[PDB]
Amino acid sequence: MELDPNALITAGALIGGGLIMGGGAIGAGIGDGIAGNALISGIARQPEAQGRLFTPFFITVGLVEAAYFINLAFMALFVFATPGLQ
Amino acid sequence: MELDPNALITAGALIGGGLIMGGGAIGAGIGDGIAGNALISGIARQPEAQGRLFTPFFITVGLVEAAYFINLAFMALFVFATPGLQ
Amino acid sequence: ELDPNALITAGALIGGGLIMGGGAIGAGIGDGIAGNALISGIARQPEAQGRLFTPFFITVGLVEAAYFINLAFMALFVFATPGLQ
Amino acid sequence: MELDPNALITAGALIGGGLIMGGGAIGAGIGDGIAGNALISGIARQPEAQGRLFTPFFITVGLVEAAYFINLAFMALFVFATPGLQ
Amino acid sequence: MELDPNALITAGALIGGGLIMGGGAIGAGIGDGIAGNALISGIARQPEAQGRLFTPFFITVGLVEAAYFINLAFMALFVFATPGLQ
Amino acid sequence: ELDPNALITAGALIGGGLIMGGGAIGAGIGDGIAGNALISGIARQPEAQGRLFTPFFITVGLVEAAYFINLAFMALFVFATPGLQ
Amino acid sequence: MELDPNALITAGALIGGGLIMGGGAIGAGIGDGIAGNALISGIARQPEAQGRLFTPFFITVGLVEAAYFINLAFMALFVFATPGLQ
Amino acid sequence: MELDPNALITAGALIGGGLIMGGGAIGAGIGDGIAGNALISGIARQPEAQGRLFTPFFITVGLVEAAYFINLAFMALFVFATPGLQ
Amino acid sequence: ELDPNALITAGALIGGGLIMGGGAIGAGIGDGIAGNALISGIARQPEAQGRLFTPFFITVGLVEAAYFINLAFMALFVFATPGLQ
Ligand SMILES: COc1nc2ccc(Br)cc2cc1[C@@H](c1ccccc1)[C@@](O)(CCN(C)C)c1cccc2ccccc12
Ligand SMILES: COc1nc2ccc(Br)cc2cc1[C@@H](c1ccccc1)[C@@](O)(CCN(C)C)c1cccc2ccccc12
Ligand SMILES: COc1nc2ccc(Br)cc2cc1[C@@H](c1ccccc1)[C@@](O)(CCN(C)C)c1cccc2ccccc12
Ligand SMILES: CCCCCCCCO[C@@H]1O[C@H](CO)[C@@H](O)[C@H](O)[C@H]1O
Ligand SMILES: CCCCCCCCO[C@@H]1O[C@H](CO)[C@@H](O)[C@H](O)[C@H]1O
Ligand SMILES: CCCCCCCCO[C@@H]1O[C@H](CO)[C@@H](O)[C@H](O)[C@H]1O
Ligand SMILES: CCCCCCCCO[C@@H]1O[C@H](CO)[C@@H](O)[C@H](O)[C@H]1O
Ligand SMILES: CCCCCCCCO[C@@H]1O[C@H](CO)[C@@H](O)[C@H](O)[C@H]1O
Ligand SMILES: CCCCCCCCO[C@@H]1O[C@H](CO)[C@@H](O)[C@H](O)[C@H]1O
Ligand SMILES: CCCCCCCCO[C@@H]1O[C@H](CO)[C@@H](O)[C@H](O)[C@H]1O
Ligand SMILES: CCCCCCCCO[C@@H]1O[C@H](CO)[C@@H](O)[C@H](O)[C@H]1O
Ligand SMILES: CCCCCCCCO[C@@H]1O[C@H](CO)[C@@H](O)[C@H](O)[C@H]1O
Ligand SMILES: CCCCCCCCO[C@@H]1O[C@H](CO)[C@@H](O)[C@H](O)[C@H]1O
Ligand SMILES: CCCCCCCCO[C@@H]1O[C@H](CO)[C@@H](O)[C@H](O)[C@H]1O
Ligand SMILES: CCCCCCCCO[C@@H]1O[C@H](CO)[C@@H](O)[C@H](O)[C@H]1O
Ligand SMILES: CCCCCCCCO[C@@H]1O[C@H](CO)[C@@H](O)[C@H](O)[C@H]1O
Ligand SMILES: CCCCCCCCO[C@@H]1O[C@H](CO)[C@@H](O)[C@H](O)[C@H]1O
Ligand SMILES: CCCCCCCCO[C@@H]1O[C@H](CO)[C@@H](O)[C@H](O)[C@H]1O
């Protein structure tokens, strides 16, 4: 008739999922930008020895992107396999 | 007009979609500004390093913008193909 | 009492506000950070001025793209709400 | 009697409007502070050639303040000419 | 006591007003601290530049505080003269 | 069931929390940033100490003004709620 | 039977209290980290004269922690002595 | 199943608890990263200052982590011993 | 209609989302800031490399601890909700 329990649960899941991905993008965009800031400046300062900067950059971006995609996976769980759905 | 389940689900979807895109823009705006800060500073320090520095700059911006547009895709999923709609 | 669109529209306005609120945080801070580098760059090399304009405009262009794309979707949310009944 | 549709829409509009102006002030306060940080430091470093810093500062503040006031305009739309009001 | 439309509108106004002032303080506190960071650093670097540096400092703080107090004015509008009150 | 003031008071407490939450973010980070400059300034010039106190106190004064003005309005929101029925 | 007024007020109080402490920890963690960043760097640069850094550090941390604990006190008021409870 | 007061109180507690821990992690992650930035930079600048620099680093991390775990304690209070439960 | 657990579970999912949203903000920015120092440190002293690994890993370890402890409590919130009726 009117509302049912899953309408409220699903609304909660979509808001929760949004928080997860919203936070993920804040962390990833700013974290990657900060890492890349050092890469750009390091290459500017030391063009001949820049190769040694790339594994540290990719380790850093790897960590940052792992947070983004682990969050993405839990957003997908929230909205496609909602825990507590009735 | 009686409330119905999709009214609540759609309200949650729009809020969730807003969180996704709001966070996306925070990460992209600040991440791109931080990347650009190093680009601008590097060119100011060494004029002829301009070509050299656009390469790590675009790698960084690529990473930052990937977050923005993956978030955009999921906002679109939330509001145009809402998971859990009844 | 209430009707379905009252709830949907309330959600759209909150969603729209999140979109624009986040857009201004990203654009204001991103542009400030870009301009910080422009100002410092010019102070360091008073006639580096000319060569700094292109990277400043590219950076601001990217930052402003996020603001404007968000603005467009806020407009969609509140003027053509997806899911309106 | 009890609630009416516009009570809920208007509550949404006020919360939305608050998000718009809250975010606008975060972006403007921090963005202007960051721009002014460079202005202060530049004037400290180069008092004789500081005049060339002011158009770049005002362009930057112009961009930052434009975000604040465009947001202000949409807050005013949300709360004084609410889209979707019944 | 039955709920009434203004109860919901006023709740939205208070939340909206809180967002406005919460964001205002984030922008003002951090923006002023960032401006002051350059002032303090500049005086440490060159003692007799103190007078010189307060001028761009107060221009910056003026901009930052304008955001805070314009936000304050609209919080006051929201909670004392609520747009849309029935 | 419910009554009008239950909803208004719930909104006031959420609004009050936003005010103080934002106030502490601004004050904690703003003060930390001001103190960062004070500490670095003293480390650079160990007897610049005296001349740094005034600009530090002016900066902290401004930051703390935002915290305290927010505190006052949180108090208004929760102890004298505007719009209470 | 169903809901009562204090259920809604108490839910508001817990959310409000959460906002207070959530914001308090953001301000304290980042503020202390920023202060400590300068302490670490200052001690690195000037090991012999580092003692003069500690009162400025503790004044700064004092200010930052005061925001955290004043917020904590108001969270405690919100959730243990809720203003407006019926 | 009819709604009951504790359903609403517990929902508020979980949201409040989430705000507490969400803010705790923002402050701790960023505060610790900022502290570590000075540690790493200081060791890079002067290798044998390593021992010296861990002392102010752990003082800083102690302060930052205190915020995280005091917040954790109050999240636990909110969700396991909810103040105001009926 | 509704039942008590619909409201509790909706709160748990929102709470869980706040926990993980905040966790990723802290971890992404904290790790980026740590890596920024690692990259700059190596660029300054190309064979400082070895001695920078330990402080980098300690910093990342602390940052990641916040992410993981948050993850565990999100899991508690949504898979074993405290207060479920
Ligand atoms: C760097 O990795 C770590 N460091 C830690 C440091 C301290 C503590 Br106390 C916990 C830590 C835990 C971990 C991981 C881990 C490894 C194994 C099991 C559980 C957790 C991690 O949490 C990292 C997530 N980061 C990158 C945002 C993780 C979580 C979830 C899914 C993952 C998938 C793939 C890889 C890592 C995954
Ligand atoms: C710098 O300006 C831009 N750069 C962009 C860069 C990339 C992309 Br893809 C879009 C961009 C769009 C714009 C503007 C624009 C110009 C014309 C039409 C539409 C949009 C803008 O969005 C800027 C807002 N900023 C400052 C926060 C704008 C929006 C709304 C109202 C405005 C009023 C006055 C001035 C600008 C106004
Ligand atoms: C530095 O202290 C200040 N500077 C200001 C600067 C400008 C303005 Br306009 C107001 C200012 C107000 C104050 C304090 C104050 C002193 C006396 C009375 C009222 C307020 C303060 O607000 C500081 C909180 N900070 C540290 C987050 C405070 C509030 C509440 C409880 C406190 C308990 C103990 C100490 C300070 C306490
Ligand atoms: C915590 C950061 C660890 C980064 C990896 C450091 C160990 C590998 O270091 C790598 O050594 C190679 C040769 O062996 C070089 O060609 C690479 O430039 C360098 O990154
Ligand atoms: C984010 C994508 C938009 C980029 C548009 C401008 C691309 C500029 O591209 C860059 O131009 C420089 C000169 O300005 C050259 O020196 C560089 O080699 C080139 O990469
Ligand atoms: C994407 C483009 C963003 C531009 C931001 C608006 C400010 C325009 O900046 C203009 O740039 C010119 C280039 O020579 C300068 O000479 C002008 O003085 C300046 O007004
Ligand atoms: C992108 C934001 C500006 C363009 C908004 C989309 C077009 C506006 O759409 C119009 O808005 C009017 C009020 O302005 C309403 O009264 C009308 O019903 C509506 O058609
Ligand atoms: C800025 C780019 C995206 C803007 C999308 C806005 C779509 C607005 O769409 C408009 O909605 C109005 C009612 O609000 C109607 O009167 C118009 O017929 C309709 O075209
Ligand atoms: C993107 C930033 C563009 C800033 C404007 C640069 C072009 C104008 O530059 C201006 O030239 C004047 C004389 O012509 C000088 O008196 C000013 O100091 C200088 O700002
Ligand atoms: C934000 C407004 C509050 C400011 C109060 C203090 C004003 C200080 O004013 C400044 O004092 C300096 C010495 O301390 C002088 O050298 C400067 O010329 C003067 O501008
Ligand atoms: C707006 C004022 C903010 C002050 C913050 C509280 C710390 C007071 O700081 C005091 O400043 C004195 C000035 O000489 C120092 O000598 C004292 O050691 C110090 O305790
Ligand atoms: C600015 C924050 C501190 C001052 C709060 C405003 C005055 C407090 O007001 C009092 O609060 C009491 C609990 O403390 C309530 O029990 C009383 O009903 C109320 O009169
Ligand atoms: C800190 C500056 C602004 C504080 C505004 C607080 C106003 C509190 O006002 C007080 O409310 C109490 C009930 O809570 C009543 O008992 C008192 O009569 C009333 O004066
Ligand atoms: C605003 C910052 C004020 C910090 C306090 C400065 C005044 C006291 O300064 C203190 O003087 C002592 C001897 O008198 C020294 O032993 C301490 O190292 C020094 O901090
Ligand atoms: C946050 C607590 C976890 C810390 C675990 C590692 C502790 C490292 O401890 C440090 O090790 C250094 C060499 O690496 C020594 O030079 C320092 O004296 C010592 O403090
Ligand atoms: C708490 C530990 C966090 C580690 C982050 C994952 C990256 C591991 O980094 C590894 O460190 C090694 C140390 O010598 C390097 O030699 C390897 O090249 C590198 O892959
Ligand atoms: C820490 C996050 C990963 C571990 C999650 C806790 C264990 C999962 O728990 C299981 O989740 C399933 C879906 O994955 C549900 O279908 C099951 O009902 C539930 O038992
Ligand atoms: C990651 C460390 C904390 C994880 C806490 C997760 C507790 C999950 O607990 C599990 O919940 C499932 C239903 O969701 C049940 O099927 C299982 O019986 C139960 O053990």
Domains of chain G (ranges, CATH numbers): 1-86 (1.20.20.10)
Is D76 near chain C, with CB under 8 Å? no
* CA atoms in the 13 A half-sphere facing the CB of E86: 18
Residues with CB under 6 A from ligand 12: F 75, 79; G 81
Ramachandran bin of E84, using left for φ above 0, alpha for ψ from -120 to 50, beta for the remaining angles: left
Ramachandran bin of A2, using left for φ above 0, alpha for ψ from -120 to 50, beta for the remaining angles: beta
State how far the Cα of C65 lies from the Cα of C79, in Å rounded to an integer. Answer: 21
| DSSP symbols for F3-24 | -HHHHHHHHHHHHHHHHHHHHH
Q: Between H19, H31, H44, which is nearest I18 by CB? A: H19
Sequence-distant (≥ 6) Cβ neighbours of residue I12 within 8 angstroms: A12, A84, H11, H14, I77, I78, I81
Q: Give the sign of the dihedral formed by CA F82, CA F85, CA G4, CA G6.
A: positive
DSSP conformation class of E47? G
Determination approach: X-ray
Neighbours, chain B (3 or more CB pairs < 8 A): A, C
Residue H68 C-alpha from the chain's centroid = 2
Ligand 10: nearest atom to the Cα of E65 = 1
Q: Reduce the DSSP state of residue E83 to 3 states and report it.
A: coil
Show the tokens assigned to B61.
Answer: 């911006």
Residue G48: Cβ-neighbour burial (10 angstroms; 0-12, 13-18, 19+): exposed
CB F14 within 8 A of CB G12: yes
Is G63 near chain F, with CB under 8 Å? yes
Q: Give the sign of the dihedral formed by CA H9, CA H11, CA H12, CA H16.
A: positive
Show the tokens assigned to I9.
Answer: 């579970």
Distances (CA, A) of F27 to E22, F14, F68, G30, G67: 11, 20, 9, 11, 7
- Does the C-beta of C75 come closer than 6 Å to ligand 8? yes
State how far the Cα of I64 lies from the Cα of C3, in Å rounded to an integer. Answer: 46
State how far the Cα of C83 lies from the Cα of B7, in Å rounded to an integer. Answer: 8
Q: Cβ atoms within 10 A of the Cβ of H62, count? A: 12
State how far the Cα of G24 lies from the Cα of G81, in Å rounded to an integer. Answer: 20
**Residue given tokens 């540690």 in the structure block:** H39
G and C touching (3 or more beta-carbon pairs closer than 8 Å): no
CB C10 within 8 A of CB D9: yes
Instruction: Report the run of H or E that residue D81 belongs to, with start and end.
Output: none
CB F4 within 8 A of CB E11: no
| DSSP symbols for B35-78 | HHHHHHHHHHH-GGGHHHHHHHHHHHHHHHHHHHHHHHHHHHHH
3-state SS, I5-56, equals HHHHHHHHHHHHHHHHHHHHHHHHHHHHHHHHHHHHHHHHCCCCHHHHHHHH
Instruction: List strand residue ranges (DSSP E) for H6-58, in order.
Output: none
Residues in chain H that come right before a backbone break, where C and next N are over 2.5 Å apart:
none
Phi first, then psi, for residue F47 (nearest 5°) are -115, 25
Compute the nearest-CA separation of D77 from chain C (Å): 11
Please tell me the number of the ligand nearest to residue C77's CA: 8
Q: Which residue, D28, A12, F21, F29, is CA-closest to E63?
A: D28
State how far the Cα of F42 lies from the Cα of F29, in Å rounded to an integer. Answer: 20
Sequence-distant (≥ 6) Cβ neighbours of residue H44 within 8 angstroms: I37, I40, I41, I42, I44, I45, I48, I51, I52
**Residue given tokens 């009890």 in the structure block:** D2
State how far the Cα of F2 lies from the Cα of C16, in Å rounded to an integer. Answer: 30
Phi first, then psi, for residue G4 (nearest 5°) are -130, 165
CB-CB under 8 Å, H17 with I22: no
CB-CB under 8 Å, D26 with E23: yes
CB A56 within 8 A of CB I39: yes
Q: Reduce the DSSP state of residue I69 to 3 states and report it.
A: helix
Q: Give the sign of the dihedral formed by CA A42, CA A48, CA A53, CA A54.
A: positive
State how far the Cα of A1 lies from the Cα of E67, in Å rounded to an integer. Answer: 48
Q: Cβ atoms within 10 A of the Cβ of A77, count? A: 17
Mutate to test the pocket of ligand 17, among I73, I78, I79, I81 (most ligand atoms within 8 A of CB): I79
CB I56 within 8 A of CB H40: yes
State how far the Cα of F52 lies from the Cα of F62, in Å rounded to an integer. Answer: 16
DSSP conformation class of D84? T
- How many angstroms does the Cα of residue I47 sit away from the middle of ligand 18? 47
Sequence-distant (≥ 6) Cβ neighbours of residue B47 within 8 angstroms: C48, C51
**Residue given tokens 């916040």 in the structure block:** I66
Show the tokens assigned to H24.
Answer: 């705790």
CB G29 within 8 A of CB H26: yes
Phi first, then psi, for residue F49 (nearest 5°) are -35, -60
State how far the Cα of A28 lies from the Cα of A63, in Å rounded to an integer. Answer: 9
State how far the Cα of B17 lies from the Cα of H69, in Å rounded to an integer. Answer: 32
Is H77 near chain I, with CB under 8 Å? no
Q: Which residue, H52, D31, B74, is CA-closest to C25?
A: D31
